[model samples]
Target: DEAKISAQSFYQRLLLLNEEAILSGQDFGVRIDVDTRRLTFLQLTADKGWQKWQNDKMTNQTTLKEGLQLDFELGGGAWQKDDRLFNPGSLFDEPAPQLFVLSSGEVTPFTLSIFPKGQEPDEQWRVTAQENGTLRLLAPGESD
Candidate 1:
């Protein structure tokens, strides 16, 4: 089936791999692309350095409700709310830094924010996708 693995299963598999890596003293991680709906498994190799565990393609196309809330159990509980008005593709362009799974049975969500250099401490910027497939960059104190 072309159906992507459930998020629950995905997290479980990650935990198992993390356990094996811990026992063998190895490094492993996973990266996800929301726009592409793809998930990749990574491992650090001695000879070739970091590499993908496999070339298989996995996708999760499940539709979520507007203002859907996702909670991750990483280092406590991290929650994020998704806005249906925002173009989902924008998430790929603003990829967050690599995620580190601290221990077994941990699930983490990737997040990103861009702050220009030399900005005032109080100055803030927000990026959101418009319903028409464009990005809306909100200045400090600006609200929808």
Candidate 2:
């Protein structure tokens, strides 16, 4: 007999991996909960380094309703977001940064990747999730 698989199966698989990583000594994972103001870090198997995400790091954490920004530097370059817009080419950027948005009333999860200054824009960040559901995106910041 052939079993039909749905998109939910993929999420289930990821959940399974997340659970296995918590139980057996084989993988590592992390979870960030904004509502609870908590950050859970974990290391699996023979990991040598310590994995952690502290609340202090999430100081400037903003809720989706208030909008957010992601500024990062890959290698020795500068990547920043100004006016809620991200300039990819300015920082050897990816086609698009994967994004997931959650809002009130109609909760829709979406991935928006705008192009650089010129030329054709690509989908740098691709979001793979169901729309009309809770959306939580994390934009980690740096320290001074």
Candidate 3:
């Protein structure tokens, strides 16, 4: 019954919010950026978290060479999973992230994926609709 209730709550969140975007991990956190054209998602999983800040922002202005590119600068530091951090891997690593492409007033049933960190950046996950009339991630990608 709790599982059903949890499921219901999740569906309601999606129906109410319209977009799913969440980021989290023990290594690195997830990032998603969108402009006019493309949507970029990235995961930076490593021992030293923020030391390797990667870019996962997708936009219409992004060049074809950077299409869905996910990598770190090796020595750079930005945001990472540190015990000093707030959630320490719980920040954005939701099994399901909320994608807020539309505002609360303009909800649409769109599905998308989020790639894992420390992997090739050219792949994308999938999204699907649940029986409860909500959109959710169906494959590897998380919602953005």
Candidate 4:
């Protein structure tokens, strides 16, 4: 059915690519270019011929509302929550984020912490990934 075709397609393609890498004794991974925001799959064959799985370019930019809490799934049953304060001009200047997906349906989590300029890293508002697929956000003085 077209209702879930996109999800099914993604899952099937992921499994097939993973199997190909395993059987061919090759390494495969998903990579994203932070600057260009291009997501690509890197598939290395046994003969060292690198193949492309998918290239999703210029999808969309995520806009964060001030003092709002956002939650969304990150596939593989993983979910993330983001809560922070950001200024207008500072948003674009912030660092680009990236993530790595593996064949086992595991995602290498990415965390983005925002703090006021000129502050120490330790004192910054922190967002950390937990083993249970939930993100933990801590304010400046909160402890682990």
Candidate 5:
């Protein structure tokens, strides 16, 4: 039940946000972004006031560890945040570190296994998804 809830949330978050944006798996975290265009439409719908509506919605980035094993049932570009996007395998000895696997479709499943570390006066993040074909990344303030 919990995993289902997670999958549903991820479904809306990724696609409703961006259809094709690059996502990142950092040190131990993941990053998903926003499409300015989607926000504009989202804002309009909420403003219609049909249901005694409210406007000004907010979105937050989610971590991959929580969403992948990830099937799109879907859904990055980077966003306006304080962190940088690094190659998911940047910190590993393997040409491409085993980051995570993502499946895309309704009732899809995902699995994750990544390593982590932080250093002095320096920061480098590592992450990416193997979507057999999707997870093409997150919002870039650009068109889908």
Candidate 6:
């Protein structure tokens, strides 16, 4: 049968070994919601851990919207809007010493003015996706 029901199953079905390390453990994952995004934290709750989208220690990034300053929307809520949650990566998860962009829209689109050090400029290719698999091309000046 040419058209068949294909399944890429293995001995163990769980994608991650230590599910708790990510599910309810002390871990973080950022969510950049184009249609609906977050610390820019996606959704911090009992089932989900913490998340972020800024890196003050990475050499200070500046985000702008049509010549005006703005910050990434925290889709989760407004509790940690001004809180410190930068560099939401596996290795670097440190809080900002001084708050950047304290208040702004939760879903307003903006452009980046500065990026982390050692960053190469590229107009195309690369996306910053959330946990639920919302893939998209990373905005110009944002990362690439």
TM-score of each model, in listed order: 0.40, 0.22, 0.22, 0.32, 0.23, 0.20
RMSD to the true structure for each prediction, in A, is 14.1, 16.4, 17.5, 11.6, 16.2, 16.1
lDDT of 2 by residue, 20-93 (tens): 44454344333323222122443322434433312232221221222222122222233323442334444341
lDDT of 6 by residue, 1-144 (tens): 000000011001111211322454433232332211111322233543332423332211112222121233232222212322333543232332111221221112222112222233233222222334332344343442
Deviation in angstroms for 111 in model 3?
2.9
Worst 10 residues of 1 by lDDT: 67-76
Span of ten consecutive residues with least summed lDDT in model 4: 58-67
Each candidate: what lDDT? 0.39, 0.27, 0.30, 0.39, 0.26, 0.24
| Candidate 5 global CA lDDT score | 0.26
* Lowest lDDT 10-residue stretch of candidate 5: 35-44
For all candidates, the clash counts are 0, 6, 20, 0, 27, 1
Give me candidate 2's TM-score against the actual structure. 0.22
Tens digit of per-residue lDDT, candidate 3, span 45-87: 3443232224343211221122232221111233122223133
- How well is each residue in 1-144 modelled by candidate 4, as lDDT tens digits? 221232233334444444554565555554433222233456544554544543343212322223322222333344332233333444464122233334443444543334333333343354444455444555556675
- Tell me the lDDT of candidate 4: 0.39
Weakest lDDT window of 10 consecutive positions for candidate 3: 71-80
lDDT string, candidate 1, 12-36, tens digits = 4555555655665666665543333
TM-score of candidate 1 versus the correct structure, residues matched by position: 0.40
Candidate 1: residue pairs that collide: none
Candidate 1 Cα errors over 4 Å, as ranges: 1-5, 54-97, 101-144
